[PDB]
Write a protein that holds these residues in place. Structure first.
Motif, PDB file in Angstrom:
ATOM      1  N   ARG A  35      47.513  -4.518  -9.509  1.00 20.72           N
ATOM      2  CA  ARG A  35      47.241  -5.558 -10.488  1.00 20.72           C
ATOM      3  C   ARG A  35      47.299  -6.940  -9.828  1.00 20.72           C
ATOM      4  N   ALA A  36      48.217  -7.127  -8.897  1.00 24.70           N
ATOM      5  CA  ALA A  36      48.387  -8.399  -8.221  1.00 24.70           C
ATOM      6  C   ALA A  36      47.205  -8.670  -7.292  1.00 24.70           C
ATOM      7  N   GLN A  37      46.510  -7.625  -6.845  1.00 24.24           N
ATOM      8  CA  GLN A  37      45.336  -7.795  -6.019  1.00 24.24           C
ATOM      9  C   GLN A  37      44.200  -8.367  -6.848  1.00 24.24           C
ATOM     10  N   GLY A  38      44.144  -8.161  -8.144  1.00 22.89           N
ATOM     11  CA  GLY A  38      42.932  -8.566  -8.890  1.00 22.89           C
ATOM     12  C   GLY A  38      42.626  -7.531  -9.971  1.00 22.89           C
ATOM     13  N   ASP A  39      41.421  -7.510 -10.493  1.00 20.12           N
ATOM     14  CA  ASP A  39      41.092  -6.563 -11.571  1.00 20.12           C
ATOM     15  C   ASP A  39      40.952  -5.142 -11.097  1.00 20.12           C
ATOM     16  N   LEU A  40      41.030  -4.220 -12.057  1.00 19.41           N
ATOM     17  CA  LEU A  40      40.853  -2.789 -11.863  1.00 19.41           C
ATOM     18  C   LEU A  40      39.407  -2.494 -11.461  1.00 19.41           C
ATOM     19  N   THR A  41      39.183  -1.538 -10.571  1.00 23.65           N
ATOM     20  CA  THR A  41      37.873  -1.050 -10.176  1.00 23.65           C
ATOM     21  C   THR A  41      37.810   0.472 -10.408  1.00 23.65           C
ATOM     22  N   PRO A  85      40.730 -16.656 -11.606  1.00 24.46           N
ATOM     23  CA  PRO A  85      40.860 -16.417 -13.039  1.00 24.46           C
ATOM     24  C   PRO A  85      40.153 -15.185 -13.522  1.00 24.46           C
ATOM     25  N   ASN A  86      39.340 -14.450 -12.772  1.00 25.59           N
ATOM     26  CA  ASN A  86      38.839 -13.322 -13.627  1.00 25.59           C
ATOM     27  C   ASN A  86      39.744 -12.125 -13.723  1.00 25.59           C
ATOM     28  N   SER A  87      41.053 -12.031 -13.904  1.00 26.52           N
ATOM     29  CA  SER A  87      41.762 -10.949 -13.206  1.00 26.52           C
ATOM     30  C   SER A  87      42.187  -9.739 -13.989  1.00 26.52           C
ATOM     31  N   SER A  88      41.905  -9.655 -15.284  1.00 23.28           N
ATOM     32  CA  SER A  88      42.526  -8.560 -16.038  1.00 23.28           C
ATOM     33  C   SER A  88      41.619  -7.835 -17.001  1.00 23.28           C
ATOM     34  N   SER A  89      40.310  -8.116 -17.164  1.00 16.95           N
ATOM     35  CA  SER A  89      39.424  -7.321 -18.038  1.00 16.95           C
ATOM     36  C   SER A  89      39.400  -5.917 -17.465  1.00 16.95           C
TER      37      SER A  89
END
Lengths: 97, 102
Positions: A35-41, A85-89
């Protein structure tokens, strides 16, 4: 002829409890780092699916760890700093099912 | 003017410190998975290959991976859990994994 729970039985039950705590802590640690890396893939989702099987993490517990991580202010701050800022959708969609 | 004359430090980024916390999180994540898998019993090919996918995503080097394996196989508490859970032969494949490749 009767039998009953011995000290060894209670010891084995306690080892299972300790193992389960280690397993959940391990899985939560991976969710926190991802999660700290960025959004889920999709690739990370797939990887988490295999880790939950090997660590015996139920889908209920998975979704609760995803939400915990999405909502953790420290992890959200790290993702904002590291990825923007795009980090959690996508994490949030996964935490809903 | 447009810009504040009293800048609220709330707004400031902390990039250097966040980079370090992210790395701490990655290393702790990998170590914790090694420890939990070691407490389950001996290594399997399926665990090895899953750890390989995890090490890619967490940027863990093969030297760090093997050092974590050698740590965990030798941890007295994790080994006691494994012997209770899985029986007396809970270490040989981990120890192989810790040793080879250099």
């Amino acid at each position: 002829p009767v039998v009953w729970p011995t000290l060894l039985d209670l010891s084995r039950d306690e080892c299972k409890r300790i193992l389960r705590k280690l397993e959940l802590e391990a899985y939560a640690g991976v969710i926190s780092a991802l999660r700290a890396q960025g959004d889920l893939t999709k690739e990370k989702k797939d990887l988490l699916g295999e880790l939950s099987k090997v660590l015996s993490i139920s889908t209920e517990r998975h979704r609760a760890e995803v939400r915990r991580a999405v909502n953790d202010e420290r992890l959200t701050t790290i993702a904002h700093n590291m990825s923007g800022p795009n980090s959690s959708s996508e994490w949030s969609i996964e935490g809903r099912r």
